[PDB]
């Protein structure tokens, strides 16, 4: 700028750390999506040989979603939430880069490995669940909702000082007026019936879905693909697993914007032999297990009757043998492949 002081400008330009000078990342892309571009990176000087994740934020400048992600990550500190190490602001192209510690694994790949094996885990499942609840409880206590919880966003650290530690990532930081309206497998039924705002209870439903999938290796509410919140086939799958809710189970279902549509399309009789008990029996989980009774409390249809993250953390399941461990792999060797480059 002409009206900016020149000495001030050149001093800052001389001192400013550029992402391309500090890190080696070309050809090392490991992710690509609506979030942006994620790279596996090494430090160019030989101070430490650790792996780092570099996220180039989607778009240019500082959008409302970019502003809020920086704002909140700058404050949040907890072992089970991914930690922002540094921000690079690239003046030439107006791009924003975020530096995090590198997580070798995630629940999407871990679950796919077990699902692929067609031809430790019980201690691992509990420990994963406990750390996901701990992480989300920390965000919730700070009035920060995730708003997009699923196995792809539950990272797990590989070999290093934080071996087998869960890291929650890719929080939905920007949603206009906190609104859902502006593959549906992890979405709470109230969202599908047109709920106008995200809640803590919506995150908890997603954790219930993740927990079912960890126990069975299959997405509990799996459904075919395909603006409006109402999605017929996703609701049908929910009722096929859960049963259709009685008036007493969800009294305020009448207040949901899409309730009359539900009544128009669905009949109670269709799901009269469907229940979570029967579904989980077919996938070798016992209904009198402490694991199951907790799952049912997490997967409660009416959001006000859904258990909170803190109450789920106090569940006797986590006092039953085996106890949860800081390393979810529990000292055992990691059989899961390292993630490949793009």
């Amino acid at each position: 700028d002409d009206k900016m002081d020149y000495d001030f400008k050149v001093k800052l330009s001389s001192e400013r750390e550029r992402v391309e000078d500090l890190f080696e990342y070309e050809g090392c892309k490991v992710g690509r999506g609506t979030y942006g571009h994620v790279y596996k990176a090494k430090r160019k000087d030989g101070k430490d040989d650790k792996d780092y994740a570099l996220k180039q934020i989607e778009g240019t400048g500082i959008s409302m979603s970019a502003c809020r992600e920086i704002a909140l990550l700058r404050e949040l500190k907890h072992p089970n939430v991914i930690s922002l190490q540094k921000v690079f602001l690239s003046h030439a192209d107006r791009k924003v880069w975020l530096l995090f510690d590198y997580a070798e694994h995630d629940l999407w790949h871990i679950i796919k490995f077990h699902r692929a094996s067609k031809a430790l885990p019980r201690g691992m499942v509990k420990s994963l669940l406990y750390q996901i609840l701990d992480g989300i409880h920390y965000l919730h206590a700070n009035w920060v909702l995730h708003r997009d919880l699923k196995p792809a966003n539950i990272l797990v650290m590989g070999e290093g000082p934080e071996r087998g530690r869960v890291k929650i990532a890719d929080m939905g930081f920007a949603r206009l007026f906190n609104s859902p309206l502006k593959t549906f497998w992890y979405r709470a039924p109230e969202l599908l019936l047109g709920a106008r705002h995200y809640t803590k209870a919506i995150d908890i439903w997603a954790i219930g879905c993740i927990f079912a999938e960890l126990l069975t290796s299959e997405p509990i509410f799996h459904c075919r693909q395909e603006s409006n919140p109402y999605h017929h086939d996703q609701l049908d799958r929910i009722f096929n697993v859960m049963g259709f809710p009685a008036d007493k189970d969800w009294e305020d279902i009448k207040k949901m914007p899409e309730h009359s549509t539900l009544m128009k399309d669905f009949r109670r009789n269709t799901y009269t032999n469907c229940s979570l008990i029967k579904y989980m029996e077919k996938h070798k989980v016992k209904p009198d297990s402490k694991a199951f009774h907790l799952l049912q409390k997490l997967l409660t249809m009416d959001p006000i009757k859904r258990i909170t993250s803190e109450q789920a953390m106090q569940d006797p399941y986590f006092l039953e043998d085996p106890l949860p461990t800081s390393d979810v792999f529990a000292g055992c060797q990691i059989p899961y492949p390292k993630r490949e480059f793009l």
Binding site: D5, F8, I62, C67, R68, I70, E75, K77, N142, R175
Partner: protein, 266 residues
């Protein structure tokens, strides 16, 4: 309510509660051009400019307050000549508005707001029209975020003040004045030097005195360093005496002319 109970481990507390002597030491470079009185008068002027900009755009007081802190942080570290405060004021409002998710300020609206507010409310200071365009705002925003070390979440006295007056059972009587006095504290350095709950308690004390409300027992029932509250009370009392003696409409054009100017390029 994001991060509402996290002040003691916040970047506000850990990085941006400053030492008064370090603040004064960095101020000496601009004090070669302006007196101490003239520098305080400039701070008042640009607080009013940011207030007017936020009111024009219909932003809630907390967003306006956050934009004012951003401005103060920048010039706490750097000279007034480094970036034009006329450019920096709307940039701080724009950035602060994007930390929220309930509504968006578009580019044309920002530029229209800066142009209109300066001509209709500050023509005594600025004879020419707002000479900057959106590309200058976007560039200034990058410098601002860098300087602030990406620290965007800011705590203010409004939330604690609200809890205190509800605790007293004196919301209807005391809140409107206490809230107004909190607004006036942004004309000073207080937000850089004390935690927000202490500023709120000082503003509520001055409100009780103006309205002749006996609250000495209530203030005794608290567990707080009352010496630091008294320090804050005295800066508020002095603020209103400088207000009385200051005519910004008559003085600011001359004070703005004395500001150090930027060095041009080679």
């Amino acid at each position: 309510k994001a991060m509402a109970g996290n002040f003691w481990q916040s970047s506000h507390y850990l990085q941006w509660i400053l030492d008064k002597q370090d603040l004064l030491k960095e101020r000496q470079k601009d004090l070669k051009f302006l007196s101490e009185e003239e520098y305080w008068k400039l701070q008042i002027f640009f607080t009013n400019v940011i207030q007017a900009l936020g009111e024009h755009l219909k932003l809630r007081q907390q967003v306006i307050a956050t934009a004012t802190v951003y401005f103060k942080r920048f010039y706490a570290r750097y000279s007034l000549k480094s970036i034009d405060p006329v450019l920096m004021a709307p940039t701080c409002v724009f950035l602060a508005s994007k930390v929220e998710e309930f509504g968006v300020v578009s580019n044309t609206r920002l530029i229209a707001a800066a142009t209109s507010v300066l001509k209709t409310r500050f023509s005594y200071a600025f004879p020419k029209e707002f000479p900057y365009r959106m590309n200058h705002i976007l560039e200034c925003e990058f410098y601002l975020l860098e300087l602030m070390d990406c620290c965007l979440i800011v705590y203010h006295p409004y939330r604690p003040l609200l809890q205190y007056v509800q605790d007293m059972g004196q919301e209807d009587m005391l809140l409107p004045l206490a809230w107004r006095i909190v607004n006036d504290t942004y004309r000073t350095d207080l937000c850089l030097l004390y935690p927000p709950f202490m500023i709120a308690l000082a503003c509520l004390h001055v409100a009780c005195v103006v309205q002749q409300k006996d609250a000495r027992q209530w203030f005794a029932e608290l567990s707080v360093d009352m010496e630091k509250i008294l320090e804050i009370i005295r800066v508020i009392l002095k603020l209103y005496e400088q207000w009385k003696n200051f005519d910004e409409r008559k003085e600011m054009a001359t004070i703005l002319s004395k500001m150090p100017k930027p060095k041009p390029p080679p």
